[model samples]
Target: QVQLQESGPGLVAPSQSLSITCTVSGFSLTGYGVNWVRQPPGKGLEWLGMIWGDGNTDYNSALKSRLSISKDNSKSQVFLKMNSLHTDDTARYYCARERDYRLDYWGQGTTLTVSS
Candidate 1:
């Protein structure tokens, strides 16, 4: 019964920040790492970063200055926050469970527009 669902605002303004949440169920947060990836409306997948099962994290160097990934083991939730957004930041974001460098379970994803 493992599942992951993403929730966040559908719109954001340029130069602002974005916050998204990945609520998970049926599995313990300490058992696996969760990765966040985003795809522009018509582009390829961009790997944002991930929060490891042990509470450590690693992020894409390209986005490291503006992205952060964290998790709450007790709440079974993973969080993503990115700042200094630009128009090109618009995309559909997804959170997936990672194992052995492979993403196994993925969320439905939520689309966001970075425009005001």
Candidate 2:
């Protein structure tokens, strides 16, 4: 069984960057790709980016300029960094593992608030 958990600051200042980590268990990063997505209060889910097992990355065109995703296979961790955060960016962020063209595993999600 595979599981993922997210950890990060709950609050961030506007214009600052937000960083989050997703730790995985019961799986190896080398065998799967990790992806990030977000859902704001009262909003639909949005794709952010993804990092493949081979270390290559892909981003949503709208966020490519400000978002980056990477993973540490040895540590069983995936990291997400997004800059210029605004109030609109406040949301619950999630990390997922992709298999067979679908997201097969997901983290419980971590909420973020852009304030101050």
Candidate 3:
């Protein structure tokens, strides 16, 4: 079975960017696409973007202006970069494998808190 894990800073300063890395196991990057999703405190999940095995990508219209998703196929890892962050950007960010338009495998989400 495949698995995903997210690792990064738990706190970020307001107006600064947030960065995270997702490490995957049991599956090759060339076989699947990785996606970035997040949920604000007490809110619902929001799809940020996805990167295909060949490096193609698609992002949510609302976040397209500030989101970037990339993957290192040889390392089985994916990276997410979001700039110009704000307080509202604070949330639990997760990296997942896209399965039939839904995330069937997810990372143990990493919380990102925006503070001074």
Candidate 4:
């Protein structure tokens, strides 16, 4: 079974940017890629972006200006970067294995707080 773990800072200053990584094991990047999904306090999910195995990435229209997704096939890793964060941007971020536009395995999400 494939497993994903998200690692990054727990807190980010307001208006700053944040970068996080998902290190996955027991899977093949060539077979499928990963997606970065996030959710704010008591809200619905947001499809921030995704990095396909072939190295192409796409972002949500709402976050297109501030979201970026990348992957390192050699390290079996995927990275996410979002800028201009605010209190509303604070959320529990997660990484999931994507196949046919559906999420498979998911990582234990990590919280990122945006505060001064």
- Clash pairs, candidate 2, are none
Model 4 CA deviation exceeding 4 Å by range: none
- The residue pairs found clashing in candidate 4 are none
- Compared with the true structure, model 4 gives a TM-score of 0.94
Give the per-residue Cα lDDT of candidate 3 at 33: 88
Clashes of 4: 0
What is the per-residue lDDT of model 3 for residues 1-116, given as tens digits with 9 covering 90 to 100? 99899987888787788779999999988878898989999999998889987789999998898888888888888999989888888899999887566778999999989888
* Whole-model lDDT per candidate: 0.93, 0.93, 0.88, 0.88
lDDT of model 2, residue 104: 93
Per-residue lDDT over 80-104 for candidate 1, one digit per residue giving the tens place of the 0 to 100 score: 9998999988999999998887899
- With candidate 2 superimposed using the best TM-score fit, by how many Å does residue 70's alpha carbon deviate from the native? 0.8
lDDT of 4 by residue, 1-116 (tens): 78999998898898898889899999888789788889898999888888888888888997899888988889998889888887888889999999986898999988999989
TM-score of 1: 0.96
Model 2 residue-pair collision total? 0
